[PDB]
Amino acid sequence: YALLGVILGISGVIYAVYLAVWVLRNEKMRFISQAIATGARAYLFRQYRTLAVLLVILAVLILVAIDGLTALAFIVGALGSMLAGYLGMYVTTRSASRVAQAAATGGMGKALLVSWRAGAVMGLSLASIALLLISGFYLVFRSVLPDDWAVPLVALGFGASLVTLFMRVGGGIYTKAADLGADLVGKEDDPRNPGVIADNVGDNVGDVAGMAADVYESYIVTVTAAIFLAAILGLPTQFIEAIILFAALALVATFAGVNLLGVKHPLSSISLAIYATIGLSVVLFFIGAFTLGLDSTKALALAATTSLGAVIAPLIVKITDYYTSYNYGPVRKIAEQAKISPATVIITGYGVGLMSAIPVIAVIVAVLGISYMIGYYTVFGELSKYLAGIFGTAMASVGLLVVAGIIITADSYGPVSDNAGGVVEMAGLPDEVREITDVLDSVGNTTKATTKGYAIASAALAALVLFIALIFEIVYSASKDMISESLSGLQLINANVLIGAFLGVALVYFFSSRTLEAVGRTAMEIVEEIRRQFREKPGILEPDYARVVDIATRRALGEFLIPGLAAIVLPLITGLLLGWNALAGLIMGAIVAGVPRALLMANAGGAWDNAKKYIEIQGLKKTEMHKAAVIGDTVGDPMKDTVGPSLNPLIKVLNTLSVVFTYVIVSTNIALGIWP
Amino acid sequence: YALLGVILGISGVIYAVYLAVWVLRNEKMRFISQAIATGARAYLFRQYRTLAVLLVILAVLILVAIDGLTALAFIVGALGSMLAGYLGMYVTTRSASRVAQAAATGGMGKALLVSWRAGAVMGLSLASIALLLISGFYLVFRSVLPDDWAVPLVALGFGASLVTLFMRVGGGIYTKAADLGADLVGKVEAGIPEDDPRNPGVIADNVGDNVGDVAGMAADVYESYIVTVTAAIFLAAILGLPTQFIEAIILFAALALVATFAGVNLGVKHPLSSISLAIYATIGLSVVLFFIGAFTLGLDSTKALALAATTSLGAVIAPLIVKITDYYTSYNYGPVRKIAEQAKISPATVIITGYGVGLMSAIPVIAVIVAVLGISYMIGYYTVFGELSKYLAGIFGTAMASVGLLVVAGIIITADSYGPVSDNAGGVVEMAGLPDEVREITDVLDSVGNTTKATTKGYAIASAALAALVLFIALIFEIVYSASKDMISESLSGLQLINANVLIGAFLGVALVYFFSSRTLEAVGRTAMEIVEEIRRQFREKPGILEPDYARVVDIATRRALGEFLIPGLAAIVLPLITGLLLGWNALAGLIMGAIVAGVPRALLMANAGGAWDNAKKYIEIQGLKKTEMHKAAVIGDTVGDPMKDTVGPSLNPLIKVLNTLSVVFTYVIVSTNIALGIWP
Ligand SMILES: [Mg+2]
Ligand SMILES: [Mg+2]
Ligand SMILES: [Mg+2]
Ligand SMILES: [Mg+2]
Ligand SMILES: [Mg+2]
Ligand SMILES: [Mg+2]
Ligand SMILES: [Mg+2]
Ligand SMILES: [Mg+2]
Ligand SMILES: [Mg+2]
Ligand SMILES: [Mg+2]
């Protein structure tokens, strides 16, 4: 069913129009909702503009680097994600006023389903775009250039990661640089300062756009890495045709996931995502045995491996939901610490962030470990079996992210409720209706953390699969064998490998701490900019929002190239100056440190944010107790949405440039495996 | 010259009495100095009491586990460090009042040398105790039981690490649980500056100061001096190199004791004198080591200089970390003012950016420890049975480097007692309302000490990073000995980084450290709350205006802190054991990998930021010197990085280091449970 990948995929626009026309179904509410669009307009118009500049130049560079041709698949790969991004962005800006007007007089359900449908637009679209764009080029290359046709479409992944890197560090900086600069100049969502629109425009850039594009990396890298695996091993094409079927059902499981046909409490979100998976699993178990014929133990192995990747997601949902929701303790543990002081709640609110990372880690290892076994016992040398093992882990990581559609649907429901939460406080809407937007926002805050777990954890499984894929790229370049030398050259105790593991964990500090000082300083350029305008005339009686948008992006994107390119070079220099061993260690320590830390922060930031919401509804005042809880908010605030989610686009892309330069780096090493 | 290692060592305690009697050379000033002693008394009396309980029980267990005998060296090994601790404890309690009275009327020099002399007591003694304690049992075991006599004396390291674990997690908790409980009750209920006499937390804090950096840190570094000499000597023995190397290293260490005996001698102006002496206390050691090294031992000119070059790389890195942390930690330098100025905005903004300058302060240390062992790896590889026989000459070149780095520990611990002793004086002056100017100079000695304690965390942790790979190779030969009753062919191809259990372990190793630190953070944060409540019950009874009570606050904090200690302490012992047996030795090899990969960068990330927030407070606390919205922000950052500075940062290092020390003890016990050479179940 290779051709079928396009059939159901193109229905994304078919179904995105349904939800788009669903959202398209006040004076002050319209201007602010329209302001989010104009702000997001100048953002994307300027973000895609410079984005295409570097894409075409590098697409021209990749065209000569491949010389068949691959820059063509390189280009559309990036265009696919951005297309689903522009589709979901125009929805979020309009939802801010839609869900606000719907919730106030309709009830809690009206808000939950409206803000949820606005998110189903992006989730189902992007997932649809990913499947059809690879299945389209997969079938084209399948018949076009035999003998490793899957590799050409794999460059579609690299070009698509370059753009997710763009908005994660760019949108991540902008999302928090505005949230930070707007919050403290007020000391929230007060109309006096223009930072309220720059923040909410950031909300759609941090979690709606920046995060949704990030997970696009998960859906594209594993399908290209998993297909690339089954090819390089020499296994039958039965494996490659089954994975495309599992993916299509995930689109079917996410097409059904978003129906949500009586809403009561915000638990409805977790239940649907929970059963949107089982509906996929058993439908996958059953459709898997239908299209392909394999020995019963081997065919279920595919259904069992992907079932392990799909199940882990609801588990991370229930975990982060526990450590993040104010309904549950670990949030009240720190919110109560507000009575003492901010420093004391900081350290202990930091603490419960650490212990919130180990449960996710405990699952991702046990989950891929079981998939490794089942895939190893079911499906030329001792490695040929071991490779069947790491492939069992590839199937797991693939199964995890193929259901990405349902999770991104939630990363747009959270911020859209954040937008609604802003619309009500600045427009001074009724107390009750402006409070429910906050709980929808606090539930959304539990969602963004859940997706960061879903995003980062899925990356951890791919790294070891990308490791093996990187090897076959250094084996191919070595011949122009290596298996006998690299195996005994990359044992963890080798000189380059251990140093790299320290430079990989040291590089991530230099990358994240460079981002933190940048976002913190560019925000100061927003804080300074506000004074420039507010000093001229009084903010009582009101371009101005477009100014804060354009100034913050070009200053944020300006810094982006510094760490973004610095994170590109330092691995390259170590990869060539020391060797591929050094980068293998650099990518090891990075994946080993990045996955736990980003969880430590992704969860803690959400906890401090939800901790404020819990006391901001009870306290709901400027009390020395609440003032302390706000300090914890803005600390974990940018570290939550800027550096936390950036380790994932670093780790995954960190193996994505090394594999493209294995031919370029191995020839520079002038040796098979070196420690000098 | 193996016997000489003991001769000069015992002269350290002989010489330590000179400075101890030198420091021993007012009414309100006398009671507080004696109160620190009674507090340190009830602390050590209760710490050594339970410390001997588990030591004897396990010493009896180790006696049957070895069945020659090795529990004897197990006992004295731990006793050596504690002896240098009790010598420095009685010194620090007396220095609080001594240095205060000396600085006020003599000048800045009088204070700088007195608080420094009080530290030379601990530094020179402990380093002396370490050298004589190993050369003593080394020479005894060299002639007692040939054929792997070095292994029995290696058990001296584990037993000594078990207790350094005691005070790092225990003293670390106590130091910040008291520092925390005393600080916040002054701002929330009392409304007074820290180190104020009204609340009993002022004595509990300063008593903690001597336990966090003076005792907890100095005892921790004893782990560095003991583990590498046993691991490096164990390497040269197991590697098959000539005994010429084993006799030379004992001389280099003695030279370091001579280079540190001269280091403490110390015209005075700015606290830069500390960095200059510690910088030149190394070169004086290096060239003196270069010179005495060629005299006693004969080796090929290129091969003999290799020893002087390898250890010279371990010795030079320390002053480099000193100048690095001194830059990121001292208010004299930028990165501190970067955040102190952010106090004008808000605490959250200075928190995030004060956190930032902590991260980039970790990459310079990492950049050096890798370059240093890499060059030693090369020089040791090209100078000194299979492809491994040459490669092992490399990691041993790294062992010599790690050995060379920590043999100069004496000069650094001398500084870990100068920092808090100035903190003690800093407290003595503000509560006794001593002259403004002289109580301000104690603060600069306190802020300079803050520049010292962070430097030692770098010095402590970095030396551990080089030893880890040495401990990896040493643990391998312990599983090779148990496997035969070959492994080279199986483990090499069984522990390549992509193995199933190894990668899982690397995630469980970095995950376990979170479970250990966040369990420690919640404990110290909650047990401190047991101190805050304790103050109220006593302060509620009678007014704190007009003053047993100090002995209670000491006794209550220890039994509650030590009570929690067993939870992470034993949990950190088990979880590696479970992974080592449930999954295999591959899993623990990965668990110890991810731990060293996260611990070395993490502990630096925190040790430096915590020190920066404290020094950031100091710069604005003298200019502002008031309760200003600007100063309040710098205090919030202080107490955040405050416990993360002295509890989690310095406890990760004794976790990783002890993790390779317990796993090597179970190589015989864990490999038989795995029921396979290398498996990924
Ligand atoms: Mg906010
Ligand atoms: Mg927001
Ligand atoms: Mg908001
Ligand atoms: Mg929020
Ligand atoms: Mg926020
Ligand atoms: Mg303090
Ligand atoms: Mg202190
Ligand atoms: Mg103090
Ligand atoms: Mg201090
Ligand atoms: Mg302190």
Numbering used by the authors:
A (entry chain A): 6 to 30, 35 to 76, 83 to 202, 209 to 282, 286 to 403, 408 to 508, 516 to 577, 582 to 715
B (entry chain B): 6 to 30, 35 to 76, 83 to 281, 286 to 403, 408 to 508, 516 to 577, 582 to 715
Sentences from the paper on this structure:
Membrane-bound pyrophosphatases (M-PPases) are homodimeric primary ion pumps that couple the transport of Na+- and/or H+ across membranes to the hydrolysis of pyrophosphate.
Our PaPPase:Mg5IDP structure provides the first data on the ion gate set-up of K+-independent H+-PPases with E6.53 and shows that the 3D orientation of ion gate residues D6.50, S6.54, N16.46 and E6.53 in particular all resemble the structure of VrPPase:Mg5IDP, a H+-pump with E6.57, and not TmPPase:Mg5IDP, a Na+-pump with E6.53, despite the shift of the semi-conserved glutamate.
